[PDB]
Structure formats: structure tokens, C-alpha cells
Amino acid sequence: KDIDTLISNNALWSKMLVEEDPGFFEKLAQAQKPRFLWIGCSDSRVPAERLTGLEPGELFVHRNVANLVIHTDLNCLSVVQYAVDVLEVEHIIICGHYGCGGVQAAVENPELGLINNWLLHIRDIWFKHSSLLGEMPQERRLDTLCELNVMEQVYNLGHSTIMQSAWKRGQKVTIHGWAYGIHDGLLRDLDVTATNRETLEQRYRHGISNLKL
Amino acid sequence: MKDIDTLISNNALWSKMLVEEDPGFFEKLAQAQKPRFLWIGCSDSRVPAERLTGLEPGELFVHRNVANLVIHTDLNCLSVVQYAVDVLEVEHIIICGHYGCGGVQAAVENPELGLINNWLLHIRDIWFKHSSLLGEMPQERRLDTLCELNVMEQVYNLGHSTIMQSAWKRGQKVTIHGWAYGIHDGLLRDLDVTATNRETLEQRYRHGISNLK
Amino acid sequence: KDIDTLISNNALWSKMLVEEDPGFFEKLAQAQKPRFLWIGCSDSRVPAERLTGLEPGELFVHRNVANLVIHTDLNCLSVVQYAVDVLEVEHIIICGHYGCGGVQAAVENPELGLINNWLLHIRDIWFKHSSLLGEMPQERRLDTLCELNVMEQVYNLGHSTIMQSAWKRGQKVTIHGWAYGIHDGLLRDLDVTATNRETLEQRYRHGISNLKL
Amino acid sequence: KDIDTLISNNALWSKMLVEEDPGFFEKLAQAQKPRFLWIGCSDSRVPAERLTGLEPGELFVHRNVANLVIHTDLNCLSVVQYAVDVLEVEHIIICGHYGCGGVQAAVENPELGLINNWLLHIRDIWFKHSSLLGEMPQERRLDTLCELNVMEQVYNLGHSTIMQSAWKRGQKVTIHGWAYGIHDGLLRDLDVTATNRETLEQRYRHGISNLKL
Ligand SMILES: [Zn+2]
Ligand SMILES: [Zn+2]
Ligand SMILES: [Zn+2]
Ligand SMILES: [Zn+2]
């Protein structure tokens, strides 16, 4: 595939739609305001639209390596603030994927360059739950950390001032932590769904303790 | 409206159906080698990149922020690019904006939106930098032009970072492209700033500005 | 001078104070809510307290390479927000210094590594005012860019949501741009002092115009 | 407004030295690359030069709220990289101060605005050592967290790619964690002094283990 190859595909796809529904493009124009925010990995092993059946225009999408929500990352925080405060999305979905290249690179700690500093936030989670992962067999640890990371990012997101402000002013926003595998593409709900400050805590604590079993 | 239960249910159906049609599809994902493209696009994601370009899941490293910015000091985007260029060894990086972007329009109309306004100040800087150009055009012909100007500047910024400069200096083949598409037809317009090294990055940028003037 | 020296120097200074001035720690003990924010260079060739004769406790200080105020740097912005909104500072001073290593590295562009990306914000100021620097004598260009850099950061500071919100709610905050030389330690006022949105605009443009002469 | 007060003090202080000690400006004019990097709190209750008796020019200084070293803060990381790779400092000192306003705000968690997101990195420390702080009387927790934060930031600093790359190339760099009180200004060495990755690990664990009793 070269750049020209992708360009030609774009023109064809454009023509095909006009022939079938020349009003489609019109539709998107007036497609309201997205009601969901997708925070996913830059791997994008399966795009969010195929996984969820969501159409172009009802998804606000941000993607970074290993789908992180760092307390001081203005990139992700600007997305969250713009979605929550301006677009007023009602659901924020943090979704990781088993086999993530970033999560595994975090654990094996190879000299990869600038990215290693970003992956240290995941390694912090690795050691934070050093006990929990210890109770599990080695093979099932890299997948569990992937679920552990997603729960942590939600916790973080719920602690940021953007989310805390919305919940205190009564805005209806709900945070969800999901994961899917390339073995079946099936979304697994990690059960950390939060709608206010108190549920964020209880969900996170119960999420971790439930993994102990 | 559409709820979470719909998305979860859509996923289970889509998953089983695929097993029915191509049970090897999920195996392909694995075999799929490292991606070859980095897609830096807006969080609006009015049309997902995979449909616009006909690229299937696994051939795209995807990053999205408000108005697809490449700020010199944003570790988020820079970590993505470095992982793509140095670890994944992508050979094409595509920065793609879209006419009608809410962020670019918010930059120009300057409403009090909160935290996001600071992120958009990088666009207002692009507004005044080419304040002369925009004056020569009719008002209608400005909001689309800034959208194209912003994408060219981000392509410029990307090429000036140490990650790109180091890769080009060590002879690695990476090519940066600046595109835009409209929601009226979905046709990608190549902004003609395609760069393959330090000299081309300047020459094309030099070439770009003058033709738009 | 080594580490052991610094520890020993501290112990002497500690008792000497107890012996000579036991009230020094009494002043430090009281509230001493600061009224000034110092945004300066990490070079710190002359500490801010020595330049201004300010006593310990009345200075909130942030320092980075070449005293930058980037729109998307949560570090600098959090200091300013804590100063303006919590500490209620009435003056913010952005101060550069002639001979700055960062300003010199920005222009000569050596391959220094990660720092080069931070310094790219300065090269933006170098080309933005390429007109001014060309008309001036060669020797006085690096000193002028140092003055240009300080004026731009004051401009950026006034554009942030923190300052715009405070001025819009009537809070008394005043931003100043200064510079000092290593030949005499004399502070030069760059005359871009802003107290509101309107003063920020004219003062900026104003500041630039006399340098053209 | 006391800007005029500060302005005259400079001019006064400037002539005073020029008349009395014209070499003060000669020493500062001498190209003395610093040997120490100071990462301290923006409170700057006692300036670093007064605490250590260090004279102008041998101190590279960075200050943020509660002297944090975040894995993804390019501000602090650009300072560290420039010091270690360009200036080749031989010592980095992370110094907190008991009674720090930021450390206290993290624990009491008042709604202060944007700064609260920065302080969540400290709240991370507070809950990470929930066991240790729990075993101590309430009165001795805010001071302990202050020492805990300094150990963690030294831990974070030693894990960054800048330090890891520098140590692996054989460069001599040493990280130190200190604290001082407003009651006496006496530096207490927290005993986390690291010269390589292995010592950083052992130092950190022993630091936490010693606090247990
Ligand atoms: Zn991934
Ligand atoms: Zn957009
Ligand atoms: Zn400097
Ligand atoms: Zn403090």
C-alpha cells in the first residue's frame, strides 16, 4: 500500500456513497453532538466503530499508547473537559485490549527511547498490585495488568477536576472500563462503572478485591 | 437514545457473526505485523480514518486530540510518534484535519469554554501568524483556510521535533503528509506539504504557503 | 564545593541565626502569604531574592529553561493558578537574562537531545520576529530575542484561562516583563506591563514597536 | 504595588556592588557551569542559596508546586535532561519542606481548581503508604508524607530515561532527597542518595522500611 493507493480508495468510497445515499454526508453535518467519549489505545486493533456498532458522529475519540489518563496530561484532559463541559457527553468509555504492545513493553522494560517515560505510569500499576498478580500464574498476569490499568485510568478520570466538577454541579456523566481481545473481539465489562464520586471509590475497591478471587 | 446495552449487545452479535463468516479473521489480527501508518486526527472523528482510507484494523497507529495538534511540548502526541517511528517503524505519518472542526471554530469565535481554551490558543497563534493571508480572502473563505493552515503547521512542527529529525538524520524512511476532508462529500484533499527529510520539510512548507497566498 | 560542604554550611547558618537573629524563623513561622510570582530561568545566574532584595516568604518562584509560559504546560499553569487563585498574588514577574544558554541554543540549534523540543518554542519567536532582528545590528540580536521571548511569555500568560478569568472577575493581578545582565545585575523593564485584556494587547504591540527603532 | 520598590532596590544594589565589589559581577560573568541541580518547591520558604551557602552560578534551579518529578512532565524533564546531558551536573537535589502548602492541600483536598489535578500525584503517595501513615499518630502524618513525597520523586527521577541513559553511559550523577523545616532551616538528609539504578532501588526500600519504626 502506498499513499496514492489510500487516496484512490477514498475517492471510490466517496462516489459509492453518493450513488446510494447522496444525503448521507448531509446527515453527518447535522449529526448533533457526540454522546460518547472513547478513550482507547493507539494500537486500535479493532476500531471502536466496528466493536460497538456506533456510527460516525456519535463518538468523540482520543487514543494514546495503552489508553492512559494521566493526572497532568493536558492532551487527554482537554479532550475530557471539551467533551464533558462543551459537548456534554453522557458516557466516557476507557477501553484497553489484551496483548497491548505498550502494556507488555512496560513490563519487559526494553530500551525503547522516549516512550519508556510514558510507560512508567503502567509500571507503577504493575508494582502497586505486586501482591495481587503474585497470587496468579505468570501466563495470566499480562492480561490482568491490562485490566488493572483500565480500572486505574477510570479511577484517575473520576478524580480529575473536570469530572469532580460535573458531578458536583449535577451533570449526568458515567465512566466505564472495558476490554476486548483479538481472539474473539468480545467486549468485557470490568465492572468499574461510576456515576458520582462515591460510586467511583466503591467500584474501584470492589474491582480490585474481586480480582483477588 | 442508543444506550450502553445496545453497544454491548451489538458487540456480542458482531462477534458471533464474524466467527460464523471468517473464524480466521481474529487470527489474522495476530499475524498482522506492526502498522505502517500513523494517523494523527481530530477527536471529532466525523468520519473514522479506516473508512476514509480503506485501511483495515492493524494497519493504523491512531492518535486523536482536539483539532489534531502537534505541540512542541505535548508528551502525549510525542510519545505516540516516537513509539511509531522508533519502535513500530512507520513509513508514513498522516496529519488530517477536517473542515468545520468545532475546535478551529471555537479558536476563532473565542467563547469561554473552560480548560480547553488553553489548548486552542495554539490555533489562535496560527490565526495571527497568517493574519495577513486571511485578510486577502472573503470571510466565507477563511474558516476552511485556517483549518488547512493549522494542518500544515502541525506537519511543520512534527518535522522539527527531535524524533523526526533524529530518524531523518539516521537515514530512516519516514514521510509526513498533510490532508483534509469535508463532511459534504468525504473527499480527502492533499494539502501538498509532503516531506521526506529536513530539506523537503522546509521546501514543501515554503512551497505550500505561497500557492495559498 | 561538594555535598558535605553544603550540609555543613547549612548547620553553621542555622545556629548562627539562632544565636544572632532568632526572629528570622519567627517571620518564616507566620503566614507570609506571597504577593509576587517569579517566573524565571533555571540558569538562575542571580537569584530573584538578591536581584530584588525580597525577603524569604514573599516570593512564589517557578523556573524552567528560558523562562517559558507555554499554553499547554500544566506545570507552569498550575503554579500560576495556585498563585493567582489561592495565594492571591498581585504581581507576576516574568524575567529573562542576557546571555541565557537556552536562547543561545535555540538560535545555534545544536543537537542537544530532549531539550531541543522545549527550545522549539523559542525558534518560533525567532522566525515570528525575523523582520525586527534583520533590521538590527548583528551583535544585538541574541539579546533582543531574549527580550522578545520575555514579552511573548507575558503575552501568553495573559491569554491563559487563569488570567482571563481572574481579570474578568475583577481580581487585581499585574504581569511584568523584566531582564537583567550579568555585567551589572540591573533589571531592565521591558514596558509590557498588563493589568487587563486591553492593556495586554496594546502594551505588547507597543513593546515591539520601539525595538524596531 | 511595590514593583517600584523592587526596581529601585535593584538599581541601588547594583551600584552598591559595582562601587564596592566590582568582581561580584565578574564572577557571575565567568562561565561557571553549575554542578548541582535543585528541584524544590515553589514556596521557596528559604532560598536554596541561603540554605546551602551556594554562591550565584553553581545552582540550576527548578521549582513547581510541592517539588514533584512527574514521569510525563516535559517541563521538569527538559530541565533534568539539559542539566545532565548538556551542563553535566554531578548532583541533583530534590528538597521538600515540612509544612508545605501543596502537601497539606493534597491531604485535606479542598476545591482549589486546576491545581488539584497536579496534587493528585501527592494523593497517590498518601494512599500508597496508607498502612505506614495509619500506624502513626495523626499529628505526624503531614510531615511524613512530605518526606515520602521526596523519596518518591527521587524514585521517579531515577527511573526516567534521562537518568537511566546517563547512568548506563557511565556518567557520574547522584540524586539526593532532602528536607528542611521552617523552625530551624536545617537540612535533614532522607537517606535515599542514589548513584545507579540498583542503589536507587535499595535506597528507596530502606527509606520506607526505616519509617516503619
Ligand atoms: Zn495497545
Ligand atoms: Zn475537529
Ligand atoms: Zn537562561
Ligand atoms: Zn511547599
Numbering used by the authors:
A (entry chain B), C (entry chain D), D (entry chain A): 2 to 214
B (entry chain C): 1 to 213
Paper lines:
Carbonic anhydrase (EC 4.2.1.1) is a zinc-dependent metalloenzyme that forms carbonic acid from CO2, a byproduct of carbohydrate and fat catabolism. Here, the serendipitous discovery of two novel crystal forms and one new, high-resolution structure of carbonic anhydrase 2 (CA2) from Escherichia coli that arose during a crystallization campaign for an un­related target is reported.
Here, we report a case of persistent CA2 contamination that crystallized in three forms. Two are new crystal forms and the third yielded a high-resolution (1.43 Å) structure of a common CA2 crystal form. We report two novel crystal forms of E. coli CA2 that was obtained as a purification contaminant.
